[PDB]
Amino acid sequence: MDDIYKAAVEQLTEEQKNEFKAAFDIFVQGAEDGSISTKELGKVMRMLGQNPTPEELQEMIDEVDEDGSGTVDFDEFLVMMVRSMKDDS
Numbered sequence: 001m002d003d004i005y006k007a008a009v010e011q012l013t014e015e016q017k018n019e020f021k022a023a024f025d026i027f028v029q030g031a032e033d034g035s036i037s038t039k040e041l042g043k044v045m046r047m048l049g050q051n052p053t054p055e056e057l058q059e060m061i062d063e064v065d066e067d068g069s070g071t072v073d074f075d076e077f078l079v080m081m082v083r084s085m086k087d088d089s
């Protein structure tokens with residue numbers, strides 16, 4: 001059910017796990033804990049190379065938010081990044 005996402009992050013190698021940190025540092029450096037809202041998350045996706053629609057981006061960020069804050073952090077972004085791939089590249 002949900003383990004498919006947890007297994008993807010575990011299967012991902014360390015070099016890939018660090019890639020998310022480099023992109024997230026752009027907004028984490030100018031933040032306290034490193035949490036972004038959906039309105040600013042669109043810029044994070046466009047900057048990383050994502051083209052998700054607005055009606056779909058809400059679910060993309062709301063479904064990964066488990067704590068219920070409405071803001072994607074490093075942990076949530078890691079689970080949202082593997083879903084944005086879907087197939088091979």
Ligand SMILES: [Ca+2]
Pocket residue numbers: 065066067068069070071072073076
């Ligand atoms: Ca959150």
